[PDB]
Structure 1
Amino acid sequence: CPRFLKVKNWETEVVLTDTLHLKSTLETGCTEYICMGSIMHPDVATKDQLFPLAKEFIDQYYSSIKRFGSKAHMERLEEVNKEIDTTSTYQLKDTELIYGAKHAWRNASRCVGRIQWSKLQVFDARDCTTAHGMFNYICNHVKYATNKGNLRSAITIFPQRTDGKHDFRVWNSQLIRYAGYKQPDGSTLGDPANVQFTEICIQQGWKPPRGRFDVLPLLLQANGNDPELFQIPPELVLEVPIRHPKFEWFKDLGLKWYGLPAVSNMLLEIGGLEFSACPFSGWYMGTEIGVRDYCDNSRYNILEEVAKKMNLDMRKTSSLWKDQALVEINIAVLYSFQSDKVTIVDHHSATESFIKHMENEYRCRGGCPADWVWIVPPMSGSITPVFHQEMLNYRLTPSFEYQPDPWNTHVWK
């Protein structure tokens, strides 16, 4: 592969140069003959597979702290090696675990908010053994990160995978989501995207309120055991009711959303070690709620109803009634959140900060992998600076990875 790759920004003519891609550790899905950049998703490690993976991580850790080739470095290599040989695995030091987590985020090519990658509170939950313990750890995470609306980014990391039959898993794909209920007539109540999961919860014993915005319980799996249900204390779930700075009628739509975006279904990979339960959270970009959650057809789909109250001609598409309503919904979301002093970032600010971040990363690190398809906001694309920014995508490690839904893989006891 070429040593230097150049990326251009077409708005500003700025050309950046990328050397970091050479450290790419895995497959993107693309080949020389086909590109899969718009494809969403394109058993344990052996002693022999694990050795080089850990050395790679450790070397990079000691390289980061400016102690490469030092005594401490070679001792750590020797200690890890002995440990893998004797136990078929190894344990990270707390310093290494934190470094690993921050760099997983730093390496997340699909994340527009990485400017903050080094401010991340890491909670080490590797001493956890039961689902009840997972519940305590998770509640503690929610409260710390919510911080009465002044959100703080954080991750809680459960014990790594051992044999594969003892994984810890949060079954919710996000810590806080709303329930979805399929009706006999085929209409859905709540968030239609979570019908399947809601049904599992009800099967497992959940008593469903059957409202529009019901916070789902946690479904938590410890040490390969069957999952257990817990209700997050309502007082820990910060919520924001959506109103509009102009249309007094907007609050009549009865809309609200949760303040904490917290992904819980991904697998954290550090130095060959797999952390299958690693809930992490930041704060929302407005479009996530105002465009995707509210206006996707297979989601809350409020476009028509908002358009009606906006009194818009809705017979033609070329009136751009959808577009017009979309803007207002997003003005509302950003407005309601700022008013309740709950941290949120609009897509203009977020994308600008990312360009600054990206430029700094080329400077100091020699690149910054980014997935354009995800970075570019789902509205007003070309009026944000990232639309014009050429990006290179590649997978560096440590990383956050997708993994199978656990209800497909679980062996019930």
Structure 2
Amino acid sequence: RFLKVKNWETDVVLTDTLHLKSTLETGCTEHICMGSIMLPVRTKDQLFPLAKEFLDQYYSSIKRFGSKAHMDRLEEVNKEIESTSTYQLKDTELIYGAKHAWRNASRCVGRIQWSKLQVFDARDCTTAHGMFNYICNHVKYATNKGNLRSAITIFPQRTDGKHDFRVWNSQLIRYAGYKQPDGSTLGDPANVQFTEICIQQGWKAPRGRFDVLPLLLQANGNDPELFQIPPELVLEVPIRHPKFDWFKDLGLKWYGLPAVSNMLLEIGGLEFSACPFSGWYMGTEIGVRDYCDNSRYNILEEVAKKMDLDMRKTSSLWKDQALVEINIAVLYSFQSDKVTIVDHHSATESFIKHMENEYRCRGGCPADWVWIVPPMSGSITPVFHQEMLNYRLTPSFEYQPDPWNTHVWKG
């Protein structure tokens, strides 16, 4: 079967065959769409199909499908499964797997880059201190003094689910949040809960608006341990505006390296529960969401007050006006300090080109419109006008429950 998607701005129609290779489910049925819902220990029996399917994909990509090398590797993996109940990926397969999980990430707008990914293989890691070292090297390599480079570090896979490696931070670098007795929040409200856990674990909190959180690291299913990223490794950008000289006095800065650390990488049926990855920011993530969500730094009032806009009626569009200026400041600041960042015009346009390329060469490009369309100026970016089809291919990045809810404390 063939599915068609249309761009309502250009009338370009594309044809998706790739959806045929999807097995995993969406949350949707013929009777309900869940496209806007945020979040909608394996047997030998289930594992060999998953391994075979993966290695068949791998060997086709290298043009060696049905070669002796392909057949021997199936046999080698099959035997490994029956006798040890799992298997080890070759390095080539790990690299390919990681690249493809990115490629298959339907909520990621930056996929044009998927083939340039530095893979750090941390499968020899055994302790939290080892994890810490691996993570400092990643931050250093990825940051590259502002000229950011895509990277992923891969810690050992799940075995029995009692020995999991986990990074408890949701991002390697994030600012602390502190709930106050009077109900106000100091710093980033999104991270209050994790901050509390850190404090309980023994972190000494500076209690300021932008405190970089300590890493909380779990190796081999053991209780996690606290470590501080060396500050010289944490690149940050003070936020200022090209025409508004009062913008600096707002006190804003942000960090340059966004590194998601709480997701699970599935490759060939194997589960990598600690696999932090990073790229670079699109401006709106900071200027729209991190600064202007009511749930976050919530600076819209202060910015519009300093601009002296008419704030008595929503219909002046004061919020929209302050929003643009904040976003100009973020992009301005990052460019001034030579820290990689991309605007939402450039990023979405790159994505459309990537997407059409994927249709030609691969038969499709699964994409989640709810997530691909930026949180400001939606329809003046070309993605708003692009029909998309969302489906789940493996290898994949998945959500996983927060580790404080599941961890069996050893003491």
Shared topology, TM-score over 0.5?
yes
Q: Distance in 2 between matches of 1:288 and 1:264?
A: 17
User: Root-mean-square deviation (CA), in Å?
Assistant: 0.3
Shift of 1:314: 0.3
Is 1:29–2:50 an aligned residue pair? no
Q: Counterpart of 1:50 in 2: which secondary structure?
A: helix
Structure 1 CA distance for aligned equivalents of residues 4 and 48 of structure 2: 34
TM-score, normalised via structure 2 length: 1.00
Q: TM-score, normalised by structure 1?
A: 0.99
C-alpha deviation, 1:324, in angstroms? 0.1
Whether 1:210 and 2:218 are equivalent positions in the alignment is no
Equivalence for 1:394: 391
Q: How many residues align?
A: 410
1:340-351 residue pairs with structure 2 within 5 A?
A: 340-351=337-348
Q: C-alpha distance in 2, partners of 1:407/1:75?
A: 42
Deviation per CA, 1:241-264: give whole Å up to 9, x if none: 000000000000000000001000
Deviations 1:312-339 (A, max 9, x none): 1101000000000000000000000000
Deviation of 1:84 after TM superposition, in Å, equals 0.1
Deviations 1:116-173 (A, max 9, x none): 0000000000000000000000000000000000000000000000000000000001
User: Residue deviations 1:363-405, cap 9 Å, x none?
Assistant: 0000000000000000000000000000000000000000000
SS of residue in 2 equivalent to 1:220: strand
- State the shift of 1:288 in Å: 0.2
Distance in 2 (alpha carbons) for counterparts of 1:33 and 1:271: 32
C-alpha separation in 2, matches of 1:165 and 1:112: 35
State the secondary structure of the residue aligned to 2:315: coil
- Residues in 2 aligned to 1:288 and 1:228: alpha-carbon distance in whole angstroms: 29
Structure 1 position 11, deviation (Å): 0.2
SS of the residue 1:269 aligns to: strand
After superposition, where does 1:271-350 map in structure 2 within 5 Å? 271-350=268-347
In structure 1, distance between residues paired with 2:161 and 2:276: 19
Q: CA deviation at 1:178?
A: 0.2
Distance 2:258 2:316 in 1: 34
Q: How far apart are the structure 2 equivalents of 1:271 and 1:182?
A: 42
> CA separation in 2, counterparts of 1:278 and 1:397?
16
Query: Any idea what the Cα deviations from partners look like across 1:187-246, whole Å, max 9, x if unmatched?
Result: 100001111000000000000000000000000000000000000000000000000000
- CA shift digits 1:54-78 (9 cap, x unpaired): 0000000001000000000000000
Aligned equivalent of 1:238, options 235, 252, 273: 235
**Where do 5+ consecutive residues of structure 2 fail to align?**
none
Whole-Å separation in 1 of the counterparts to 2:252 and 2:355: 35
CA distance in 2, matches of 1:319, 1:38: 29
Aligned-partner Cα distance in 2 for 1:256–1:105: 29
Q: Provide, for residues 68-118 of structure 1, a one-character-per-residue CA deviation record: whole Å limited to 9, x for no partner.
A: 000000000000000000000000000000000000000000000000000
User: Secondary structure at 1:90's aligned position in 2?
Assistant: coil
Q: Where do 1:124-203 residues align within 5 Å?
A: 124-203=121-200
Could you tell me which of 368, 371, 375 is aligned with 1:374?
A: 371
Q: Which residue of structure 1 aligns with residue 108 of structure 2?
A: 111
- Post-superposition Cα deviations, 1:11-62, rounded to whole Å, max 9, x if no partner, equal 00000000000001200000000000000000x1000000100000000000
Equivalent residue for 2:39, pick from 17, 23, 41: 41
Please state whether the residue corresponding to 1:248 is helix, strand or coil.
coil
**Mapped partners of 2:355, 2:91: distance in 1:** 28
Deviation for aligned residue 1:184? 0.3
Q: Which 4+ runs in 1 deviate beyond 2 A?
A: none
In 2: Cα distance, 1:28 partner to 1:93 partner: 30
Equivalent-residue separation in structure 2 for 1:364 and 1:371 (angstroms): 20
Counterpart CA distance in 2 for 1:174 and 1:148 is: 19
Q: Quote the offset at 1:355 in angstroms.
A: 0.1
- Separation in structure 1 between the aligned mates of residue 315 and residue 58 of structure 2, nearest angstrom: 55
Residue aligned with 1:257, SS: strand
Separation of aligned partners in 2, 1:150 and 1:14: 35
Distance 1:192 1:162 in 2: 35
* Separation in 2, partners of 1:176, 1:70: 45
2-structure distance, mates of 1:150, 1:35:
41
Distance in 2 separating the partners of 1:276 and 1:331 = 37
Distance 1:73 1:298 in 2: 51
Specify the SS of the correspondent of 2:4.
strand
C-alpha distance in 1, partners of 2:48/2:383? Answer: 39
Once residues 119 and 243 of structure 1 are traced to their aligned partners in structure 2, the CA distance between those partners, rounded to angstroms, is 31
